[PDB]
Design a binder for these strands. Structure first.
Lengths: 258, 259
DNA sequence: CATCCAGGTAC
DNA sequence: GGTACCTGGAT
């Protein structure tokens, strides 16, 4: 509940960090005990899947966030702060934190599955430029990637995707250009409106697997199945498009093979 | 700006005149047609009238007009008791979309002035079996010409502020190169004073032929490049392919004259 | 519908 | 400190 507000700070700096809010959400939803029953039925009769857990956590975290946002809004308006700037700040916070929340939830799932990873580490492309490529996750480590890219997984994760899936194509290209075509680059989106073209385009242009929010999987696969063309390798796309829920065991499977 | 008739039963932003209209208003207000007549000549103040300066000035004026309209709409919706959070979100979303569109429109105005034929809104189909495809902001001179001979056309991707979204262009370029081969001409234009050296270099090494930067950033960007002291870095290779925004118009002219 | 990001926030 | 986020609607 009640935040200490410091109005000398940018309003959103008064809002607890996303990791804290996720931890709050995890505690409030009893997610750890829920995670102990992954792939079993919950009391409502739904299978406890990583995608459902992620969605529930992302919603609860947002609710908690919104409470904090309200507190900050009220404080800052009481201080005379521009409403327009405040709302802009909040929207920008929501974008950043919405993404971060999903990323953090992803790591909580990696952790549960005992998957070794490194997060937001920069893969240098030019040794003389500090800036490089920063997959969301490198599994198991950047060391393993650099020594044998075929043995590591690079995962980029996005919540809503819009046209931004092309960023993943670009990242994959930069990395493939440097490290060769043996890298493994997986895309995760968490977007019910994820498009067939984006999936096929990615899979044809340097992305090895595409993971979709579970609720989009069936309809997406049905769209793929409606296509008929000798140059359309339907089975390739069907195999390489996966439910979000499957990624964790897929990673384990991969590591066991590589 | 005019006093809008605001219908509060519409989405708030549907009461704001479209970007094309605002740009035309700005053009009139700034007498941009007279500025364009004086392109590459000195103005009264002493500064050369460049495409980038006209673009920036026009962009800023259109934004100012937009904001005046936004304020009118805001006041009307607040009087109606409309959700402030939703209103402001809607306006931010309008500003993102409109700010991009405004830059693209401004770019076309410059293209027109130079007699550069172009098409905008053309989808380059990638698959026979999907209608969706790649959508450069501009294809010069036309998508038919591109498809006839990809080497003979220029694909131009245009962004205002860039952030990480430059990788979209690398993505687009890869998709197009995969389909059409490496003889395509794919140019990136950013209108971003914070455009980064990494983005320029990575783009140029990864399917972007030419990178155009808002004029104000060109010098400092090149200086950063020059300050890479590792002798294994071949600055010349990159510097030649990084250009000021203002240069793109003559570059297109010279390209078309050659092709 | 796909693309914009008149863009600040967050780690 | 510098880059990636888009708990995202408008266009």
């Amino acid at each position: 509940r009640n935040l200490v507000i410091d109005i000398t700070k940018k309003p959103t700096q008064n809002i607890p960090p996303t990791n804290e809010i996720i931890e709050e959400a995890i505690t409030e939803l009893n997610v750890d005990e829920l995670l102990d029953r992954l792939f079993e039925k919950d009391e409502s009769g739904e299978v406890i899947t990583p995608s459902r857990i992620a969605k529930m956590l992302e919603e609860k975290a947002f609710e908690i966030y919104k409470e904090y946002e309200k507190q900050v809004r009220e404080a800052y308006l009481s201080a005379g702060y521009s409403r327009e700037k405040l709302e802009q700040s909040f929207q920008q916070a929501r974008f950043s934190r919405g993404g971060k929340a999903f990323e953090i939830i992803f790591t909580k799932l990696l952790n549960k599955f005992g998957i070794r990873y490194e997060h937001d580490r920069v893969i240098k492309i030019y040794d003389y430029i500090t800036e490089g490529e920063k997959p969301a996750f490198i599994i198991p480590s950047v060391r393993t990637f650099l020594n044998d890219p075929s043995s590591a997984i690079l995962i980029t994760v996005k919540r809503k995707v819009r046209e931004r899936w092309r960023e993943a194509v670009g990242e994959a290209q930069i990395l493939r250009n440097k490290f060769g075509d043996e890298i493994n680059f997986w895309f995760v989106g968490f977007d019910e409106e994820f498009t067939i073209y984006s999936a096929i385009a990615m899979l044809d242009n340097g992305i090895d697997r595409v993971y979709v929010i579970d609720g989009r999987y069936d309809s997406l696969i049905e769209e793929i199945k409606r296509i008929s063309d000798p140059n359309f390798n339907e089975d390739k796309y069907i195999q390489k498009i996966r439910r979000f829920s499957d990624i964790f065991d897929d990673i384990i499977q991969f590591l066991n093979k590589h």
